[PDB]
Amino acid sequence: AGEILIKGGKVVNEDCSFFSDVHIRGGKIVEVGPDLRVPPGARVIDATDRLVIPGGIDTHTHMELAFMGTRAVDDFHIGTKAALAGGTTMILDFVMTQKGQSLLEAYDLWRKTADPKVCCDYSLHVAVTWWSDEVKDEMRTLAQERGVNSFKMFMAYKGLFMLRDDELYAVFSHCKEVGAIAQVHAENGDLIAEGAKKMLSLGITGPEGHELCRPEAVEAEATQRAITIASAVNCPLYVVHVMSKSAADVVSKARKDGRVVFGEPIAASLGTDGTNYWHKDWAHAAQYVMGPPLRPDPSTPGYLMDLLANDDLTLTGTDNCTFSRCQKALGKDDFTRIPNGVNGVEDRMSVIWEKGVHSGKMDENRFVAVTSSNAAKIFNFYPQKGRIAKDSDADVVIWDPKTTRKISAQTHHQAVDYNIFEGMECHGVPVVTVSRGRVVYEEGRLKVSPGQGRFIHRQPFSEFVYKRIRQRDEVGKPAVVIREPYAGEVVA
Template identity: 80%
Template sequence: MAHKSRILIKGGKVVNEECSERADVYVEDGIIQAVGLDLQTPAGTRVIDARGNLILPGGIDTHTHMELAFMGTVAVDDFYTGTKAAVAGGTTMILDFVIPQKGASLLEAYERWRNTADRKVCCDYSLHVAVTWWDESVKREMETLVQEKGVNSFKMFLAYKNVFMLSDHELYSAFSHCKDIGAIAQVHAENGDLIAEGAKKMLSLGITGPEGHELCRPEEVEAEATQRAITIAHSVNCPLYVVHVMSKSAAKVVASARRNGRVVFGEPIAAGLGTDGTHYWNKDWAHAAGFVMGPPLRPDPSTPGYLMDLLANDDLSVTGTDNCTFSVCQKALGKDDFTKIPNGVNGVEDRMSVIWEKGVGDLSQDPPPGRGL
């Protein structure tokens, strides 16, 4: 018989969503077998003394982009380094995004992501699939992905004009099909047309630095797209998941919709819960560029606390990171034009600690039930 790995985590306080309680945790071959006091375990079980410590379930990062080819370069976190960082920070599962180019097969892109990830991952993972264009072949491939591959979430972009963005008519068709095949629709909610015009305006005014990134895509651009996506999804009775809710304005739209009975879920991310967009005006260009992501962090310093309060109230639902890391040299592709700065920040290792620090606080106190971890 193969040797089994047995671990007893003893004397800690177990924190679950519904409560926290003093309990031991018995793990066999990586699977939790029992939680309780005075557990009886086989001889030779390794015992970890957790007295004075908290025991949390492994976290799930709902939004990552490992080794994504984007804006003329490739994210530096691959599926090995990225998931290794996740585990180091207490996250034991990630959900990455398959993002096919316009005109490309969703199924072929999915298999390519799987082949890349399977050889490298250090933790559990699953995949969302993006719909970046629309015709009958995309519709058929979505059905195959649901029925044969277990995919149950598809992401649509209202931003990145001429790259990933869908029209309202295409969104209506995609949302309708998600409803028909039992999948949830996801959206990157920013008005791509207004961003394109805003970027032209900023550059014409001589604003080329990272601050231009936020100035050309203000809160109302995110809020408008969020409201539009919710309206379209509701018209076809399709559940909607809004990724990376970054502003108070967009968060209010999600919260209001939920309170009015709409089936919509909002996802703030670690960066948006942990800091704000004042960094874009830092005099050190590399520092400012390091925070460039879409949608941008908001310069209103009260935004992180506001988003955290809505997360605690269940007006926002889960937390991801949008982990899509680029080096200083890669960010420098946009040294003279902010529209060419690769969009993305880190966070997969820090998400759990950011939520704990900002959402729970003093570790000496009894923790409230965890939300969005």
């Protein structure tokens, strides 16, 4: 039948927590209430002394993304298994279209790669790495027909993905017309390009040059710039992988000023820092290289977690894009050749619980909001996911917040052979993971097959995102002053 009763636990949604059992049938939660009856044949999962939470939604992944022909080692199959083992039940991955290439072709290639491999549900964001009439039409098709309401634009990567301010204005205006949210990689690509050339010329070829060539002012600048453009066109904006206190403070100030913008720190920037780039062991230092870089101010992850607790920042992903030690070593002599990307998909939930809830910065309900609910609201499938409620999808984690686990590359399920959180002791253990109403992870073992997950098709004009946008189109139009024509003389 696929019938499950989760009994004895405490349900934790983003608004409040309460003791209740949860009845799962046919992929769905069909009842939430105290002391529910066990129908003959249903499996009982005993959640006594545990929390029963919506499974995590990782807003930010890059499973098996190609770097110069060699692919990230966590692929859609191993990467989603690792997600489940860490309490995350959905991933949103970026379709990376090359400059001049069809976005629809790249979307089809992502679906054909991911559909037969994912072990949990997923969806896609689509990168807009160039601009033309064709891109414009393909974005409308993606939004209206292909289930994608999120487009990602780059202010970094000069010559490769970067768009200039005039093209960002056009692309953002078009996001707004099709009801999508505009995501941005906010670092100044002209400064990165110059900074890297400068560090190499000085013989700083190691990972410390990767951070030194683009310190946090470069990320803060472009973040304010994207906000200013999106505000000029009334387009909702999403700043992916916020890595620094000063970029987080730009998003914080803009939201207090009423800008429709959301900021997304990732597990890496919440759980570790960039002092690792200065480690004497080259291999250790290269493990942390990603764009934008982790920051060498050690107060950074605690401050980003304070701003996530306070809703200056709103939700979390991992930017999981993993490369083995032998793949990182492509840039042993030149940091610009190190394939960028770190791990996180598996450890996100425990890292945030340990650094955010156990530390007393946020409570269990805000934890659910920043790890599933807000993702579901922004990308338009709430309360289908991100809530324990009748009629929601049965993507459910039984969570032990009292026991600790030590995070280690020796025990993790990711394909990558190191872990940037190596050694960390976290309160908060996913003990059972249910995905699409099936037990896919329990007693430390995965039970799931490649292709069991499904692509989630979303509609455009997410209400959480657009209700203010649409009201501002109605009352915020600029008005002419009514005047008599100017009568006087004009110079020759």
